[PDB]
Design a protein around this ligand. Structure first.
Ligand SMILES: [Mg+2]
Ligand SMILES: [Mg+2]
Ligand SMILES: [Mg+2]
Ligand SMILES: [Mg+2]
Ligand SMILES: [Mg+2]
Ligand SMILES: [Mg+2]
Ligand SMILES: [Mg+2]
Ligand SMILES: [Mg+2]
Ligand SMILES: [Mg+2]
Ligand SMILES: [Mg+2]
Ligand SMILES: [Zn+2]
Lengths: 412, 114, 51, 114, 114
């Protein structure tokens, strides 16, 4: 045991101690048995933000012309450098263009941009924003991402999924870059720092299933027929609630299958906006430790999928203490899609196929075609077995590597 | 029923200023009125070894059993111990300087009955 | 809280403890809130020496 | 009201110097004036096993119940024990050397009433 | 002022050698002179469940309330507890073997006034 440690206050030399909770400033531990981390040491928020090369910096707007809408140098509010571009339009879309001084070759490149929403209103509170390349023949190629409330309320990088191409677009001979939106009664959005990242590697597919519905058993069989890995975005309270959600033993049995892995989705699915940041933090923490008790270990349990897709920088800041990467939600093919190299592990979305497989199978085919990563998701109650088989056969027939979220984060 | 105020039993201390490099404070329970002691506090001024010894002699230290209890480094206080010694069991506590230079040692505790 | 752990020496079963400094030989922690490492597990000195 | 000074109860110790490799200090509460003991400190001098035994005999150790309480490694002090033994309940504490060589064992504590 | 030496209150122990696989040591505070006990130490020889029981009967154990306090594995000692039982509140401590084979159980503590 020895004699008591040096110091004033209560000091004690113990042999063996047991506690429910220990708060320590310094802990000197000679041998640590603590595989179940709650707080992770890694802060992913700004690691990937400055990958690749800055293509358009917006630090001088002499090179930019408004096709439609209006543009100014924002010097009060800046993501990077001396200024950002403020895009403003009324009862219209915005579309702004920069002519390249020579033919750019963007073969195997992918695109990323800093964005903040000040205001968007009309038919929607939100807009697709499109990076829109123009070739030497006036064909377009389009990549896009979504400006939304919450997730867009503070500066955050989007990594742009492929969206569309005018047939015969010459990616080796790009002459103009365009940034554009849908039309709305009001648009006021800041952009900065377009970045180019190498995405010349193979296309990739990530499949997540949300909210631990009993249909995850059939999903495991179906995606198992081609060895595509499934992420269960898991809420540990939901286990054994009902016939409609997995039992604890079913969940453990599922995770024993080599293609099924679990990621956190909050103990009781507390989404941003619906609950306080403190309540969501408790849900995040309890989700993490309950899933760790179920055997979900480190690289897997470092991923979190936003409950109901809701998030903001507030939630990202809190989540960064517990998780490295998170995923939102979207309805369309470009929402699934990212370059293989992210610049934000927090702002990127997933394409739902609850409402039919079309946009997801488009995303899988575009992931193959344009060398991109597609993240597709469903709830196994919404989706029929034939729909799962359509998606599974789409993935197996396409030129993509099916991957885990862990693999994807290890590639960054 | 009968109410009594309990004040705690006799304070004990041993001290030495300027204990040379290899030299020691010998805490002897023969200095206690009750002839036994419990040292709670060792305030040490620099690095020390604490050692518990049994003597062959009733009244003087001739080492029989000796155990080095613990080593303390730098300056500070080990507080709230219960190292115990008595005259009749011929037990001594030695606090030996290990600092490479002179230190002040103050040891405090309580007298215990034999 | 439970009963005191197996062993001789001073043994204690606690609910909640606060400390400035904790020295442990073995620490079995079921959930760790310790993102701020001082001492890193990785010894980089000789990993790259045979690339 | 009435004020009384409480001095703490009778000191107890058992010791052996040069306990051979497999041999032991037998701490016998028959050696206490009150016939029961509580050992607080074991200063161990090297590796030891501590063992609590009940005897079939009122006065001698003939093992009935025996539990190995704990093993200590190397030199040091097990401070803050409460291992208890009495004569009338025929309970003994054995501290057995496991060092591979001769050691000094000092055990200290307090006498308790039966 | 008046000085008094406090020796500590009556030692209590219960023990059983060779407690069979599912059998138990029943620690009964009726065996105490003061009719209440505080168990500090359970030295267990193999795996045990510790259980606190209230009886419906003043003198015999007929289970009313029962709580499993803790489970202990392998051989060792739980030291420095305060699990408490009295005759008049009909409270018993049961230590049940769970080892799959015979064990020696020694429980020690102190008598307390009712
Ligand atoms: Mg800028
Ligand atoms: Mg003497
Ligand atoms: Mg010696
Ligand atoms: Mg004498
Ligand atoms: Mg006897
Ligand atoms: Mg036996
Ligand atoms: Mg007798
Ligand atoms: Mg009764
Ligand atoms: Mg009951
Ligand atoms: Mg009664
Ligand atoms: Zn969900």
């Amino acid at each position: 045991t020895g004699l008591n440690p040096d110091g004033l206050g209560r000091t004690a030399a113990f042999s063996n101690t047991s506690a429910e909770s220990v708060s320590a400033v310094d802990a000197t531990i000679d041998r640590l048995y603590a595989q179940d981390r709650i707080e992770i040491p890694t802060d992913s928020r700004q690691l990937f933000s400055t990958r690749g090369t800055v293509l358009r910096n917006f630090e001088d707007l002499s090179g930019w012309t408004a096709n439609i809408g209006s543009l100014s140098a924002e010097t009060s509010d800046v993501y990077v450098g001396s200024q950002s571009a403020r895009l403003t339009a009324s009862s219209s879309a915005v579309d702004i263009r920069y002519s390249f001084g020579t033919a750019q070759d963007f073969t195997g490149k992918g695109f990323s941009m800093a964005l903040k929403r000040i205001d968007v209103s009309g038919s929607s509170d939100s807009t697709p924003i499109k990076i829109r390349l123009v070739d030497g023949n006036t064909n377009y190629r389009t990549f896009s991402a979504r400006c939304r409330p919450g997730g867009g309320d503070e500066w955050g990088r989007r990594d742009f999924g492929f969206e569309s191409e005018d047939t015969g677009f010459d990616v080796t001979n790009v002459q103009t870059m365009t940034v554009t939106t849908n039309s709305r009664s009001s648009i006021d959005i800041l952009v900065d720092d377009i970045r180019v990242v190498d995405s010349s590697g193979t296309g990739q597919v990530i499949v997540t299933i949300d909210d631990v519905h009993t249909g995850d058993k059939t999903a495991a069989e179906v995606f198992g027929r081609y060895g595509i890995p499934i992420g269960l975005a898991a809420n540990a309270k939901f286990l054994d609630q009902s016939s409609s959600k997995l039992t604890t033993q079913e969940f453990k049995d599922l995770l024993a299958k080599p293609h099924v892995y679990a990621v956190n989705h909050g103990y009781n699915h507390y989404d941003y906006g619906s609950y306080s940041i403190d309540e969501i933090e408790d849900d995040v923490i309890r989700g993490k430790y309950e899933l760790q008790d179920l055997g979900v270990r480190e690289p897997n349990i470092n991923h979190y999928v936003y409950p109901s897709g809701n998030y903001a920088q507030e939630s990202i800041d809190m989540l960064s203490n517990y998780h490295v990467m998170s995923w939102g939600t979207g309805a369309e093919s470009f929402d699934a899609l990212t370059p293989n190299q992210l610049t934000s592990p927090w702002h990127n979305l997933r394409c739902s196929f609850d409402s039919g497989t079309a946009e997801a199978e488009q995303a899988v085919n575009d992931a193959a075609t344009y060398n991109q990563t597609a993240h597709i998701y469903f709830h196994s109650d919404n989706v029929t077995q034939s729909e799962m088989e359509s998606v599974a056969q789409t993935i197996n027939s396409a030129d993509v590597t099916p991957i885990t979220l862990m693999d994807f984060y290890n590639q960054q | 029923t009968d109410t009594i105020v309990n004040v705690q039993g006799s304070f004990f201390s041993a001290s030495a200023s300027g204990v040379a490099d290899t030299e020691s404070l010998l805490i002897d329970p023969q200095d206690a009125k009750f002839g036994a002691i419990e040292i709670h506090n060792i305030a040490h001024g620099g690095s020390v070894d604490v050692e518990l010894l049994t003597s062959s002699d009733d009244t003087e230290l001739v080492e029989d059993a000796a155990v080095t209890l613990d080593s303390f480094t730098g300056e500070g206080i080990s507080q709230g111990n219960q190292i115990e010694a008595s005259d009749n069991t011929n037990t001594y506590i030695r606090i030996t300087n290990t600092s490479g230079g002179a230190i002040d040692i103050i040891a405090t505790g309580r007298e215990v009955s034999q």
